[PDB]
Structure 1
Amino acid sequence: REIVHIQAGQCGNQIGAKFWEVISDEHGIDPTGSYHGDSDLQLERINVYYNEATGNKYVPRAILVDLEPGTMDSVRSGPFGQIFRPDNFVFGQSGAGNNWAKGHYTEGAELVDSVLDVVRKESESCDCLQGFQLTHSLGGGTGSGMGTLLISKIREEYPDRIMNTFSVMPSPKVSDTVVEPYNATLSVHQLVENTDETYSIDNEALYDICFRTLKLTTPTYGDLNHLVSATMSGVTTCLRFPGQLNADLRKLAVNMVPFPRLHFFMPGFAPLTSRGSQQYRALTVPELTQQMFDSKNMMAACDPRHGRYLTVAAVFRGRMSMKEVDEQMLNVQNKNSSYFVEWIPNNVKTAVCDIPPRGLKMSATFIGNSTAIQELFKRISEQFTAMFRRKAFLHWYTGEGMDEMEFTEAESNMNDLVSEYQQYQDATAD
């Protein structure tokens, strides 16, 4: 019935702010927090992401967390920044300094109980809370560390509820903080254990989209954060908008996750656009169905053609021929059956929304459990094991109290998931 969002660190609060900018217009809510839209389907399931207030005002069910008042201030002193309840801004002055230990163990731990004071208040005023939504930076410190600390600490207090995350995997292409594969792997070790599902927003794919496709020479965060939110309104479309289903986080989890460690989804929206560009010609259902299953469209830098889809959930928006949709989806699977597991009967499920997004007559979201997600993890271990070999930068972690073996404990927990993803990839029915 209800969802509690949280955002951690720089990226967390940056990608999270944008999600709240997109879904407010998608619901006819103004920067003031008041409703002024036409259709009443915009209010049918509004309870999900919004708290009803006085003066018939809506306020997002979101907590703003960071060990730095930076992004925190730019957001608050920004566009839709007025919309959020100022009390929920749980902002410390430490600064995890791109350190997992600083956020999860040391400086972050000091804050966490203050954050939890707020999550408890938001969960209380819920007819039925279904679960939590986390938007965070996987290479950082508050995002990566404190964010997973917060997970473990929430998963403790509410084991019965869904734990869904939007984790942004770092790329040496986008960020040159050398320690990222340490904070990356350290966070993976935590996700595989305390989240129902995870959307892998890989910063590598994100960049290549803006660079090679969108032809933006010097992509700004704005150009990447736009692709993130476009995917996020997409994946959340059925949770937010009424229709065919019903439309629960647990119903998805149950159907989309066959094995519990493997809940990392490879998102991948079609049609790819440049931040704030006017759309000329829209695409047809074949153009959509086709483009949406392209590696060139995945938000994680993995080739679905190198793997096998355990599950797929494709979400189409706008007004289109479903018989044409069913014609196309069954063309795709029935021609490329080799990429889908024989031992999961009917692994591809398609949902359609008549409400398309801003400036798009038609869009089409992709959520798949392709074993090819191993490529993302593989990468990370090769980056980590390169540094951990020469035991590089380690004193940044140890000096925070952190143990040497905690790294090797995470390195191999990470190394297991890859063999585990491979195991099911090679696995056959016969």
Structure 2
Amino acid sequence: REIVHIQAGQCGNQIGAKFWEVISDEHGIDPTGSYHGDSDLQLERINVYYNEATGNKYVPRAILVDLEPGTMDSVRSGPFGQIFRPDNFVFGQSGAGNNWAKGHYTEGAELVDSVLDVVRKESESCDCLQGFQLTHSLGGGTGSGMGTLLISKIREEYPDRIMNTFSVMPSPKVSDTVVEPYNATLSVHQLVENTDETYCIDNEALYDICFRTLKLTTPTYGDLNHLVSATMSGVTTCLRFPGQLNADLRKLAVNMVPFPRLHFFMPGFAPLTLTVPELTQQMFDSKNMMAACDPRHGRYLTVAAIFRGRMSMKEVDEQMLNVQNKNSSYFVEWIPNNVKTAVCDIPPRGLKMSATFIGNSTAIQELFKRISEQFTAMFRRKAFLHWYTGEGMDEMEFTEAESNMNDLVSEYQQYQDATAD
């Protein structure tokens, strides 16, 4: 049944706004919240993301959070600003300052109770809550710190509900802030313990796709978010339309997560703006991944593929087998039948057919290794720590966060090197 969306910080509210832009378009919901669509095979599972207010109005089950009021006001003036319920906007006064400690412990802790009041109001109205999804970044302050605090706080009141998340990773290519490896490593510490299924949206991968593949010398956030919105639409297709396979967040978690800590996925998408072999060949390719990791450098524990558009289901079964059989080295032998596939007749906007990829590869360690270097290069000489230790933290937490993320890398390596006998 119901999923409660949350968007935290500048990044989280922008990609969240673009997510609600695209899925409202797919379900045939205009900015006034009115249904004007052609198919019913749009309203069947509309209640997963929308509430039915009086006048046949469809309002997103979305909660907009930020310590900065500026980024939230830009959402209300955007294309789908008025569709959101006005009470769900939970704005702060101070601002983040790109500090995880301010987001997690002090200034974000001031605001966290007023967010929970909206969450509890939305969750009480649900017939059967699946769980929650948080769109946010790990580099900044609000989305990084307060987002992980919200997860911990919501886990406390809803311990048997799913908590997935769409975590945007930092990169030197896109971002200029130097403290982001601290913020990311501190956030990853929390996500390892308190989330069921994280989609790793890497800004390095989105830059490289925009620069190399899409061929853009000047890649804006709008160019990056076009890929993210298309990815987010793809991975939630089985949740949003009447489908056989992985219709809820728990079933996806049961299929994709063999071990509790290893729940950090590698999303993929094709085509990047066309036959089924070409779609299948593109979606598994390293250049179509939204995490900057080569899957040839590791092994797939579990995979989920979502094909969209009218196509031969016979052909989809063959091509998904042909890539599996002829690349069997890159799938663990000790999880048989680990690649599941779903079909959906309704394609995305513009495309005739598309394919979305969700992969729990061991090669995701490359992402966490890259963050660990950028963390350690600064942390060896205790650089920029007065920002955090002034806020009330101590060097234990950084030592713990470093060690906990390096354990995650060792665990991904441990099961990569694992064998049948």
Mapping of residues 82-97 of structure 1, within 5 Å: 82-97=82-97
Give CA-to-partner distance per residue, 1:115-159, whole Å, 9 cap, x none.
001100000000100100100011001000000000000000000
Where do 5+ consecutive residues of structure 1 fail to align? 274-282
Moved more, 244-253 or 377-386: 244-253
Deviation, structure 1 residue 245: 3.5
Identify the residue that residue 362 of structure 1 maps to in structure 2: 353
Cα distance per residue 1:304-350 (max 9 Å; x no partner): 00000000000000000111111111110000100000000101101
Looking at structure 2, the residues matched to 323 and 98 of structure 1 have their Cα atoms a distance apart, in angstroms, of 50
Q: Deviations over 1:375-401 (max 9, x none)?
A: 000000000000001111100000101
Looking at structure 2, the residues matched to 218 and 117 of structure 1 have their Cα atoms a distance apart, in angstroms, of 41
Partners of 1:6 and 1:221 in 2: CA distance = 20
- Shift >3 Å, 4+ stretches: none
- Displacement of 1:75 in angstroms is 0.6
Distance 1:68 1:355 in 2: 38
Return the alpha-carbon distance in structure 2 between the equivalents of residues 197 and 327 of structure 1: 28
TM superposition shift of 1:402: 1.1
Deviation at 1:293, TM superposition (A): 0.1
Query: Aligned partners of 1:256 and 1:237: how far apart in 2?
Result: 16
1:312 counterpart SS class = strand
Identical residues among aligned pairs (%): 100
Is 1:310 the equivalent of 2:301? yes
Report the equivalent of 1:61.
61
In the TM superposition, what is the alpha-carbon distance from 1:404 to its structure 2 partner?
Answer: 1.5
Please state how far the C-alpha of 1:294 moved relative to its aligned partner.
Answer: 0.1
Taking the aligned partners of 2:83 and 2:399, their CA distance within structure 1 comes to 43
The structural deviation recorded for 1:243 is 3.0
Aligned: 1:211 with 2:202: no
Shift, 1:244, TM fit: 2.6
**Counterpart Cα distance in 2 of 1:213 and 1:107:** 41
**Structure 1 CA distance for aligned equivalents of residues 70 and 357 of structure 2:** 33
Secondary structure at the aligned position of 2:6 is classed as strand
Question: 2: CA distance between counterparts of 1:147 and 1:11?
Answer: 11
CA contact (8 A) 2:246 2:252 kept: no
The residue that corresponds to 2:77 in the other structure is 77
- Cα distance, 1:339–1:246 mapped onto 2, change above 3 Å: closer
Cα deviation code 1:146-202 (max 9, x no counterpart): 000000000000001000100001000000100000000000000000001000000
Q: CA deviation at 1:70?
A: 1.4
Is the alpha carbon distance of 1:400 and 1:17 closer, same or farther for their aligned partners in structure 2, counting shifts above 3 Å?
Answer: same
Tell me how far apart the structure 2 counterparts of residues 419 and 245 of structure 1 sit (CA, whole Å): 32
Contact between 2:30 and 2:36, CA under 8 Å: does it hold in 1?
A: yes
Task: Report if aligned partners of 2:138, 2:183 keep a CA contact under 8 Å in 1.
Answer: yes
SS of the residue corresponding to residue 234 of structure 1 reads helix
Looking at structure 2, the residues matched to 302 and 328 of structure 1 have their Cα atoms a distance apart, in angstroms, of: 23
Q: Deviations over 1:31-55 (max 9, x none)?
A: 1111101111200000100010011
**SS of corresponding position for 1:199:** strand
Cα 1:241–1:190, aligned 2, differ >3 Å: closer, same or farther? same
Secondary structure of the residue aligned to 1:316 is strand
CA contact (8 A) 2:12 2:136 kept: yes
Secondary structure class of the residue paired with 1:41: coil
Match of 1:407 among 382, 398, 410: 398
d(CA) in 2 for partners of 1:291 and 1:78?
33
Deviation of residue 288 (structure 1)?
A: 0.1
What are the Cα deviations for residues 227-269 of structure 1, in whole angstroms up to 9, with x where unaligned?
A: 0010000000000011333611101101110000000000001
CA distance in 2 between counterparts of 1:229 and 1:376 reads 21
Moved more, 322-331 or 372-381: 322-331
Distance in 2, Cα, partners of 1:246 & 1:140: 32
The residue that corresponds to 1:276 in the other structure is: none
CA distance in 2, matches of 1:414, 1:96: 24
Deviations along 1:73-122, one digit per CA (max 9) or x if unpaired, are 11111110110011000100111111000010010000000100110000
Higher mean displacement: 177-186 or 319-328: 319-328
Q: Distance in 2 between matches of 1:131 and 1:338?
A: 35
3-state DSSP of counterpart to 2:268: coil
Tell me the secondary structure at the aligned position of residue 304 of structure 2. Answer: strand
Whole-Å Cα distance in 2 between the matches of residues 50 and 346 of structure 1?
A: 34
Question: For 1:82, what is the secondary structure of its paired residue?
Answer: coil
Alpha-carbon shift at residue 272 of structure 1 (Å): 0.8
SS in 2 for 1:266: strand
Question: What CA distance in whole angstroms lies between the structure 2 residues aligned with 1:238 and 1:413?
Answer: 33
Q: Who is 2:419 aligned against?
A: 428
Structure 1 residues 71 and 29, CA, compared in 2 at 3 Å: closer, same or farther? same
